[PDB]
Amino acid sequence: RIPLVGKDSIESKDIGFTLIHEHLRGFSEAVRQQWPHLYNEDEEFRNAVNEVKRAMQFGVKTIVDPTVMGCGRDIRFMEKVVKATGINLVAGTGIIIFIDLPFYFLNRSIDEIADLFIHDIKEGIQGTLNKAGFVKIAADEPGITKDVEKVIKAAAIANKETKVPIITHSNAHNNTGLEQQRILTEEGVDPGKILIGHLGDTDNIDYIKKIADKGSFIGLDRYGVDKRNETTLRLIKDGYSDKIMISHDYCCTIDWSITLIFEDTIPFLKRNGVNEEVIATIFKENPKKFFS
């Protein structure tokens, strides 16, 4: 019941070891359209294929790629990467903005925004039959602006209609993650269908625990570390493994490796007493629940 790029859909129970937040490529759509001389698609493709192959060599079965509007989602690029690797790849829909929406959205309703996400979930992405399996939204240093709130409310409509989960970008040093969770739950989204991202950027463990205690997954998803690993280990030590999702990604708005989790983070956890049942919770059971 999870759509996959270039493949038939799969049951959530079969997702296996999952990297929940990794971008194959990211760019600003208007800059790439206007100044293509700044970009090399062939290098981007080779890098993405190599990274996915490296992840598969460490046992990754599924990658969730939350590149959406604002970060250059390209479903045809994603399909080429799948053809070259055989990875299960989950694409999403959504909008990443920090202040205002593009000019297109002037005088358009929240429902019209939600209809875009629902189109991608139910019909397909960018004129293909590859469907979106989650909604991605953001807020950062400017906080919850008028347009940021519109996108959050549209994500809630899409989740209520289609049941796909919601992944967020937040700024770990303000309350944007807590606000995203509150607005979405007030609109009727199940808290366990939300992943509040980019929380590994803060050592304020009480803030992180507050979000998890309210029922949502917490994205310790900036790996690339000790303070992050310390915070991660402390959160694990304190019993929060069933809310933790771990990734590297580095933010797609930035126009390190996808296996640094295997070379740095997981070893560090293991040598500090984290057993293999916790690793399986974080990388298999938590994504299965999120997508269930």
Binds Fe ion (CB under 5 A): choice among 93, 249, 261, 282: 249
Which x/- pattern over 217-256 shows residues binding Co ion (rule: CB under 5 A)?
----------------------------------x-----
CA–CA separation, 101 and 81 (whole Å) = 30
129 binds a second copy per the rule CB under 8 A: no
Nearest to 189 by CA among 207, 209, 168, 174: 168
The token pair at 125 is 């992405």
- 62 near 88, Cβ under 8 Å? yes
CA–CA separation, 145 and 158 (whole Å) = 20
CA–CA separation, 206 and 202 (whole Å) = 10
Which x/- pattern over 19-48 shows residues binding a second copy (rule: CB under 8 A)?
--------xxxxx-xxxxx-----------
Give whichever of 73 and 131 is closer to a second copy, judged by the CB atom. Answer: 73
Q: Which of residues 156-175 bind Co ion (CB under 5 A)?
A: 169
Give whichever of 90 and 251 is closer to Fe ion, judged by the CB atom. Answer: 251
Min dist CB 181 to Co ion, Å, is: 16
38 CB neighbour count, 10 Å cutoff: 11
Give whichever of 21 and 80 is closer to Co ion, judged by the CB atom. Answer: 21
193 binds Co ion per the rule CB under 5 A: no
The token pair at 183 is 């607005």
φ, ψ dihedrals at 4, nearest 5°: -125, 140
Annotated binding site for Co(2+): 136, 169, 198
The site for Fe ion (CB under 5 A) is made up of 249, 251-252
